[PDB]
Scaffold this active site. Structure first.
Site, short mmCIF file in Angstrom:
data_model
loop_
_atom_site.label_atom_id
_atom_site.label_comp_id
_atom_site.label_asym_id
_atom_site.label_seq_id
_atom_site.Cartn_x
_atom_site.Cartn_y
_atom_site.Cartn_z
N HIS A 98 44.41 35.10 47.97
CA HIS A 98 43.92 36.10 47.03
C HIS A 98 43.64 35.57 45.60
CE1 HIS A 98 44.76 39.66 49.66
NE2 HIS A 98 45.71 38.87 50.14
N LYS A 122 42.69 48.19 35.09
CA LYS A 122 43.14 47.08 35.93
C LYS A 122 44.35 46.49 35.19
CE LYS A 122 39.01 45.34 35.45
NZ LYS A 122 38.62 44.93 36.85
N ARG A 123 45.16 45.70 35.88
CA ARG A 123 46.28 45.03 35.23
C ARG A 123 45.81 44.14 34.06
NH1 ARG A 123 51.60 45.15 37.94
NH2 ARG A 123 52.11 43.65 36.29
N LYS A 169 40.93 38.67 32.86
CA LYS A 169 40.16 39.91 33.03
C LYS A 169 39.42 40.29 31.72
CE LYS A 169 43.37 41.71 36.63
NZ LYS A 169 42.25 42.38 37.45
N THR A 187 38.56 45.03 43.66
CA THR A 187 38.34 46.20 44.52
C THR A 187 38.08 47.44 43.67
OG1 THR A 187 40.72 46.56 44.73
CG2 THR A 187 39.62 45.37 46.54
N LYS A 217 35.35 50.88 43.95
CA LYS A 217 35.69 52.30 43.78
C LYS A 217 34.73 53.00 42.81
CE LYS A 217 40.57 50.78 44.20
NZ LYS A 217 41.89 50.69 43.49
#
Ligand SMILES: O=C(Nc1ccn([C@H]2C[C@@H](F)[C@H](O)[C@@H](CO)O2)c(=O)n1)c1ccccc1
Ligand SMILES: O=C(Nc1ccn([C@H]2C[C@@H](F)[C@H](O)[C@@H](CO)O2)c(=O)n1)c1ccccc1
EC number: 2.4.1.1
Lengths: 809, 809
Positions: B350, B541-542, B547, B649, B653
């Site tokens: 992952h 998101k975390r 990110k 992911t 969504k």
């Protein structure tokens, strides 16, 4: 099958069967192909539980509407045992469930054995609380039992190489279908911190918080549709607790440790901090719940709507906690608050042994409960001002009566706090209550004689006859009907059957059946082989020096030595059974267990003895085992040194179930003999007055050893290694204690005990006269129902009238 | 009310109402007079649960009879969220329960909000496992999810003074109606000890035992009457544990700590012993359960009846554990055991970030799992013998490929162990899988090219459209029917509606309603006031540097500075929402949260800005919050540095729910743009190849600061204390990182990002053309259903055929 177990109507049986099948499917999520006996037990328990809930909701609604005076029974122990059969009995469901399960292809008695005991107590004090809850519900009182939901109750006892081993009693492993969690009524409890004084009174600040989450268990009355509540508190950490990250979450365990485990030490006080936290935890959460409920009805009427019963000094912190709440939070003046507290609280004492009294170090209270210590000092000052005014110049009385004990470490005497802050103080048998007024609480009795009462203990005839001995309950009901079950005084009617040859035969037949059942149980679950024609001689109770299991041991060895001396002489065969747990840290009690098994090892394997004598240690004695062995007993051993056993309740269970009693004039034995007549009891030994005479003179054990050849031989056998060949000196501690340091005067009652035991054997040779004496005991056991006991508490302490009237179904 | 929510028939509604009332009475033990909304939630949950059990029992019975190949999905995380609405959806019960509760006087949506999230995961990896379980049940596969029942899941996030605070997620406090304890299937797990060699092989002895107790949760397929099982293990101490007495009972907590809490660190490996114990605990208990089930059907057929999927390396100990069992206990020879293991196991990677890889110190494994270390060394020796034969003389390859890493402390590389012992290794998006073959696993790909696959991630259209966005599901079903819900490729049919004026209006109407609902929620539960006509710009998101929430921050400040420069110029109004949790020990991530709130404090209170710009930090982002904010979004921020986000992911969504995407060519963004067409996506920034070019040359952040005046101004504002007046140097760490130590090249994508954001604003000014592009996105989102993903795993890895056929009801 038998009438006392109720009706098994077609409609009821049909309904039970379908609800059983619904629970198996929807609740347990199993089909019949995969289901185990434990699944079947749970499906049955859920089915019976459904029948309680309607009555439980309507009982509590009724108390809200009618607003009666409420009784709050505070205890750190509730020794409940199993719940399934008790619930069926009280709901008149036993025969119907029997029929329903039979038709499903199941044996109900087998399923009953799967339930774990709720072992949330040590012995007599905890079991008394359980019998009391049953009686309060049966007498229609608005009563609540309040305690701690321990995750681990009293340890399971294993015997390994003759030694006691302890195992965690993980009683909740499979779940508890009887309780309902009530996380919505969670309450905060405070610890540590400090006291600030403001213009507007004291403030307790900077505290640590632990949450108290309640779990409610139903308590059904006997066939009156009353269902009361036992509420037990569980400890929970708050969610901001300790809130590097991982450790802070793991440290939540520290808070939750409060409700983790029952302290297994009975009759010996240890001042451990965790125990103090447990005692405050139950008191603080319970008192908030009480006040909440009262406000939902001005504190002048508080004692009119609330009674608090303290089961020994364990919940004694209720007194300063109630003062704290009324003074600090509600802002009542001291004098008014104190009046309310005294009128609300009452205290029951359960022992006179000095080492059992709670005397908490001041430095503990200082750190953990700083505000309560201040309140206790203030209570003490005002109390001693009253003593000083009543007995001017009596300075030693002031020292003796103080709640604060001076010395090496300062301590608070919790028993003195309880007397000062209660309107009633009671002992638990007439002899015990008199000893309280004459000895340990003499000063207090002189100051306030009106406070002191007696309430002789009792047992519930539901659990202790109908449930455990249906055969006897049935032959009794055949002659006199069923009313005696909630009015045990009716057993007196049985005296007119003492010469009835049919009844004599039925009483003896039921005892024989009980013994066969128990003799088989011993072989199935413990692989041990006994002769069911022998006299079943039993002593079951917690192991302590004062209970004198050792005197029993001395008799057993005497019988063995007599047999070996004259092998071809006839003796009445006996099976001697001794059982009970020892507190993990009590060395002497652990040595006594080892001695019993060691004697068994010798006696049970001597070919010359044959099956004329057997000695069995009954492992893991607990409520469910009591229900088995007690109905099987012929002889009940109640042989504590006079003045040491406050009451006893095991003694009463044996009397109700058709055993004769050998005992000292101690505790409730005195009242039992008075009820039955001394001719129908095997009384022996020193009375209290004889013990005192011996103490004044000085007890010299050597004198007995020197003058009794049979006793000398036993001591020589013990010292020399007769009962421990590979380890000759194993029992030197026991011999040394007996010879030089015996607080309980074992030797002094030896001769009279052996003589009295000969008289027991003589009567047992005449079956017809044995049974007639048995009938005289059962017939006069009525006084010892806890219904009588609770009715006296209600009328003489709580100020409420019992009611036998039913609620609508 | 709406068709996709099923029928509300008179018979069904009547039945639901009566079972609701039965549960309230018998299960909860309440009447309507005392019941709270939480009681009502529980009565509903128990009512819906009843409808599952029949199908659950018959599904498992069917697998026993038919004996299909079983799929075991091993994961340390299952991010399940709430269960009530999902169950209703999959059982076609939503409208009926809505009607039933309405008639009882209750609002079902209000009751739905009472359920706690099952927060047993951190983010994408844990939520993927949850979507996968749903798809496996919907595709009729005999699958089991296996994990740990953590008592505390991911912490609740509070924001205090702009800082993240962590609170324990005590999700089990009120109980969990969905699980069934199975104490009867409890299994032992071993730790520590030592290895003995006998004539007949190795023996692992002197171990400490911890018990593993399973809890089963049902997993319903979409309207096919299939109900699979998720089995989660809880740690229990054995009863002879540590068995002075009190402490031994309290020390049981040590053993039970294994299942206490989820480790909240994602993408950063810490070698903590408790985490290793958790990883072995799940693996050892799961493997015994697998073997048990297989024997109840010779190990040659083992890979024909069993597949084990490893969700990252967390359960990698399955490989040596399976070898241990086959060799040490079943006595298979090494080579045969290894063949079975390789054919049974498959591994999903992952991430490529080096700091996230599990590399366990040998000294830990030595002490905790001595036999597994020996097995790992033996695996390594045999593997390296093969490498040596294939690439003779290539000594550096041997060092690179070894499972044992040499150095300061020796470590085991768990990713290397997984590749060696699995028949298949897959990445989670096409770009990620290619990077694996070309970079970090290049050596392994050269040795065994056949092992390497891609399986692009997906999401379940049940939770992520029908459940969270019923308005959109409905307008879609009106045109094309209901079949798309389990065959998402049918959404392509919507392309023929891109010029349909009715559809355009309906799509836009549903988005506006979603935004109004969410705008109100913000005010009710968080007291914050937003303009629902603004563009909803969201990044949830975390929190991690890769990110690039910081790049988003730079854009926000640019917009604010531009407004202040020309206040009377028109700009498209935006509500910028950022949310996500930071790992408790990650300082930079905690600083980024503070920066976001600090920007909000300035922007949201500047009167010249008005309601043209708002910056909101969304507190406590979690599955239930995602279901609210995602349907409300206009713009989805997916802006990780190219090559760092394996798939994503959340991106999928947002695409399904009618937001447009601004993003880099990273992870699954590449495939999303390929499906929709690049014209219908807002792509910007460096590609992977551009990042590599920059790395070779050396990234110099100063160059950007020097050449971009707008960027310089922001840095100067940050350094000087513009966003922290009382604490001027608060953000010095952030500036220093950006200027000198930025692994993720924030400055390098700044210009192109701001430019691309201008193009977004331009399109939003034309509502009709915005919505047409939205329709093109929704219409091409079909590839990203986890039904597609799971069908590929089934066919290409597990060797089983998916089935859409129903089981009998
Ligand atoms: O004294 C302690 N614990 C006791 C004291 C007395 N008792 C018994 C004595 C018995 F005579 C009586 O019938 C029964 C019911 O009244 O109570 C008992 O079972 N536990 C104690 C408890 C905790 C710590 C230290 C001592
Ligand atoms: O790397 C760790 N934990 C990870 C790694 C990657 N992921 C994500 C990344 C995302 F691209 C992908 O869509 C999603 C599903 O495939 O997985 C994630 O959510 N947790 C990790 C876990 C424990 C300790 C240390 C690191």
């Amino acid at each position: 099958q038998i009438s006392v177990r109720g009706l098994a109507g077609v409609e009821n049986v049909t309904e039970l069967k379908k609800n059983f099948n619904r629970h198996l499917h929807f609740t347990l999520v199993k089909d019949r192909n995969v289901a185990t006996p434990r699944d079947y037990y749970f499906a049955l328990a859920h089915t019976v539980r459904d029948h309680l809930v309607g009555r439980w909701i309507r009982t509590q609604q009724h108390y809200y509407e009618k607003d009666p005076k409420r009784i709050y029974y505070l205890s750190l122990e509730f020794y409940m045992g199993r719940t399934l059969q008790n619930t069926m009995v009280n709901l008149a469901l036993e025969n119907a469930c029997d029929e329903a399960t039979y038709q499903l292809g199941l044996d109900m008695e087998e399923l009953e054995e799967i339930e774990e005991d709720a072992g949330l107590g040590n012995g007599g004090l905890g079991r008394l609380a359980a019998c009391f809850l049953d009686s309060m519900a049966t007498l229609g009182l608005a009563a609540y039992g309040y305690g701690i939901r321990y995750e681990f109750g009293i340890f399971n006892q294993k015997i390994c190489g003759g030694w006691q081993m302890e195992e965690a009693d993980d009683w909740l492993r499979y779940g508890n279908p009887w309780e309902k969690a009530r996380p919505e009524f969670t309450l905060p409890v405070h610890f540590y911190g400090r006291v600030e004084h403001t213009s507007q009174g004291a403030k307790w600040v900077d505290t640590q918080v632990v949450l108290a989450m309640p779990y409610d268990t139903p308590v059904p009355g006997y066939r009156n549709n009353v269902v009361n509540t036992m509420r037990l508190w569980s400890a929970k950490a708050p969610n901001d607790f300790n809130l590097g990250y991982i450790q802070a979450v793991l440290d939540r365990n520290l808070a939750e440790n409060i409700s983790r485990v029952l302290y297994p030490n009975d009759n010996f006080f240890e001042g451990k901090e965790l125990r103090l936290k447990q005692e405050y935890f139950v008191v603080a959460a319970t008192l908030q719940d009480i006040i909440r409920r009262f406000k939902s009805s001005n504190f002048d009427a508080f004692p009119d709507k609330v009674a608090i019963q303290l089961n020994d000094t364990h919940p004694s912190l209720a007194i300063p906690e109630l003062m704290r709440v009324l003074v600090d939070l509600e802002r009542l003046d001291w004098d008014k608050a104190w009046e309310v507290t005294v009128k609300t609280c009452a205290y029951t004492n359960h022992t006179v042994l000095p080492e059992a009294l709670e005397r908490w170090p001041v430095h503990l209270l200082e750190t953990l409960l700083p505000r309560h210590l201040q309140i206790i000092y203030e209570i003490n000052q005002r109390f001693l001002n009253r003593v000083a005014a009543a007995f001017p110049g009596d300075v030693d009385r002031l020292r003796r009566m103080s709640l604060v004990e001076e010395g090496a470490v300062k301590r608070i005497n919790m028993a003195h706090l309880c007397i000062a802050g209660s309107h009633a103080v009671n002992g638990v048998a007439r002899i015990h209550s008199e000893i309280l007024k004459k000895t340990i609480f003499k000063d207090f009795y002189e100051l306030e004689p009106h406070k002191f009462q007696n309430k002789t203990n009792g047992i519930t005839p539901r659990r202790w006859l109908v449930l455990c001995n249906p055969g006897l309950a049935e032959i009794i009901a055949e002659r006199i009907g069923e009313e005696y079950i909630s009015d045990l005084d009716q057993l007196r009617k049985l005296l007119s059957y003492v010469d009835d040859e049919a009844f004599i035969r039925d009483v003896a037949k039921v005892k024989q059946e009980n013994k066969l059942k128990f003799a088989a149980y011993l072989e199935r679950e413990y692989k041990v082989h006994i002769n069911p024609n022998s006299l079943f001689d039993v002593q079951v109770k917690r192991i302590h020096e004062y209970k004198r299991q050792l005197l029993n041991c001395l008799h057993v060895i005497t019988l063995y030595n007599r047999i070996k001396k004259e092998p071809n002489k006839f003796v009445v065969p006996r099976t001697v059974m001794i059982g009970g747990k020892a507190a993990p840290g009590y060395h002497m009690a652990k040595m006594i267990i080892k001695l019993i098994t060691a004697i068994g090892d010798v006696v049970n394997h001597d070919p010359v003895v044959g099956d004329r004598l057997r000695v069995i240690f009954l492992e893991n004695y607990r409520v469910s085992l009591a229900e088995k062995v007690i109905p099987a007993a012929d002889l009940s051993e109640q042989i504590s040194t006079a003045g040491t056993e406050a009451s006893g309740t095991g003694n009463m269970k044996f009397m109700l179930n058709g055993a004769l009693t050998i005992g000292t004039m101690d505790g409730a034995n005195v009242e039992m003999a008075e009820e039955a007549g001394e001719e129908n009891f095997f009384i022996f030994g020193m009375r209290v007055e004889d013990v005192d005479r011996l103490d004044q003179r000085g007890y010299n054990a050597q004198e007995y050893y020197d003058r009794i050849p049979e006793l000398r031989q036993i001591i020589e056998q013990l010292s020399s290694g007769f009962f421990s060949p590979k380890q000759p000196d194993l029992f030197k501690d026991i011999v040394n204690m007996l010879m030089h340091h015996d607080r309980f005067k074992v030797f002094a009652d030896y001769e009279e005990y052996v003589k009295c035991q000969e008289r027991v054997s003589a009567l047992y040779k005449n079956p017809r006269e044995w049974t007639r004496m048995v009938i005289r005991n059962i017939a006069t056991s009525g006084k010892f129902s806890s219904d009588r006991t609770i009715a006296q508490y209600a009328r003489e302490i709580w100020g409420v009238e019992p009611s036998r009237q039913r609620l609508p179904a």
